[PDB]
Amino acid sequence: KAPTLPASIFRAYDIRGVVGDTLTAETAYWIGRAIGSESLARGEPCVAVGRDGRLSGPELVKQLIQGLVDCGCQVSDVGMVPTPVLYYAANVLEGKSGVMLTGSHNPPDYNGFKIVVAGETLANEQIQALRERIEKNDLASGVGSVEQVDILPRYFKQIRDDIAMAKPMKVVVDCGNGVAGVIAPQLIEALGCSVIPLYCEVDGNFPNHHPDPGKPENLKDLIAKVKAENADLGLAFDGDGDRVGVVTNTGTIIYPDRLLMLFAKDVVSRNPGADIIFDVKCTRRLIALISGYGGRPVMWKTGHSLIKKKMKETGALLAGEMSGAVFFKERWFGFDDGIYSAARLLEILSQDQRDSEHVFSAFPSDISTPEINITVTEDSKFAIIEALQRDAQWGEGNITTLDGVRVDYPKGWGLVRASNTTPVLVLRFEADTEEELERIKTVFRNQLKAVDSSLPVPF
């Protein structure tokens, strides 16, 4: 008989809560019981378990493991590793199920779970099903096992064996005191680089900057060090290693959709007609670029589980999100992995005589706004999107409603979507000229005001 857990920690692509508040030891135990039960129902008793470098790790993980064991599961405990290393374990060990205890890039007090059951990364109704299992006491009982597995050397060797760097490179590596520090600098050195480490000590206090390369302020130290040491590239990993941020030898921030251009060109060169996936926040230039090299561009929803699901459904060889998650299936396993993506980036760059600044600057660049945020209310945020979906007029724009409202015009595009976690509307605009940009911003401004003439529109 299980206690009542807070419904709110069961999110779209993970479970996440505040340790000792909405996420306790008991909470973790029953989460383990729910996952092990679902894994057994899909014919999979074997479950890998990994944890990131958070302070609550070594001890919340005990409850997660005991929960799985009390279902009768055979647990492979891989210890403290990056998230993509846990995903790797769940591809190469006996079982195709895995649980990663991680709070990703959040402040120190947060922790949570990313879940793969019988090959499938859970999302949405599948995660609410785990919650429903606990509420209903619909849970397996058994006497399981625990085996310690040391998987990091095998992962390290798998990548080193696959990657062939052509010239030596000097690379600044910023791990933000997250778990990527267990492997990224060592691996990049082993590839044939000189590595200048920044915040590579694992420290769940995050005493420097939080490991979140999605926010440019967290790249300041990296940019400064790249310039100061005349390095060829700078790399920044998020806390659990599934995302990577890139800066050139001159300190230019390379956004994930532009990084995906380089990877798409590379993957499609070996794989005529390959599907390539990108999310609704990515530049329209990526559509044309994938098409021109003979690939099949596929736009999809944001969210790691949803990308991986779409990968399996389409046979796509590569995917990327604007979050910085890059998903290689070609030569790899199809999951998001910042470390492997860094390695694949270094392989390509090592083969070009130009510096990283010039490799990236050669791609088409349009006029783009930064990401625009409008604070609305929790009551109104989804309804504003729905009102637009019902009644907005966009001329000849090609409308995509996969995730908010995106409109593609011949020479530019715009997106508005509701944040899943904050009372905020998130917008982006791009076009090839200033005049066209103003036209696109105006259509979106007019359509929002048609919903509510009192909405703040700061553009």
Q: Give the interface with Mg ion as residue ranges (CB under 5 A).
A: 104, 238, 240, 242
For 32-152, list the strands marked E by DSSP: 46-51, 74-80, 97-101, 110-117, 120-121, 145-148
- Helix (H) or strand (E) segment spanning residue 349: helix 338-350
Q: Which is nearer to Mg ion, 232 or 240 (CB)?
A: 240
Q: Which is nearer to Mg ion, 112 or 295 (CB)?
A: 112
- Minimum separation from the CB atom of position 52 to Mg ion (A): 9
Q: Which is nearer to Mg ion, 295 or 334 (CB)?
A: 334
- Minimum separation from the CB atom of position 336 to Mg ion (A): 8
Q: Pairing mode, if any, of strands 74-80 and 46-51?
A: parallel
- The string of DSSP letters for 400-431 reads E-SSSEEEEETTEEEEEEE-SSSSEEEEEEEE
- Minimum separation from the CB atom of position 104 to Mg ion (A): 4
Within 8 A by CB and 6+ apart from 271, the residues are 295, 317, 330
CA distance 427 to 444: 10
- Minimum separation from the CB atom of position 17 to Mg ion (A): 16
Q: Which is nearer to Mg ion, 104 or 305 (CB)?
A: 104
CA distance 452 to 447: 9
Per the residue annotation, which of 56, 104, 323, 341 is the catalytic one?
Answer: 104
- Minimum separation from the CB atom of position 238 to Mg ion (A): 4
Q: Which residue has the tokens 């998001």?
A: 336
Active site residue 341: no
Q: Which is nearer to Mg ion, 114 or 417 (CB)?
A: 114
CA distance 7 to 177: 31
Residue nearest to Mg ion (CB): 104
| Contact present, 322 and 169 (Cβ < 8 Å) | no
Enumerate the active-site residues: 104
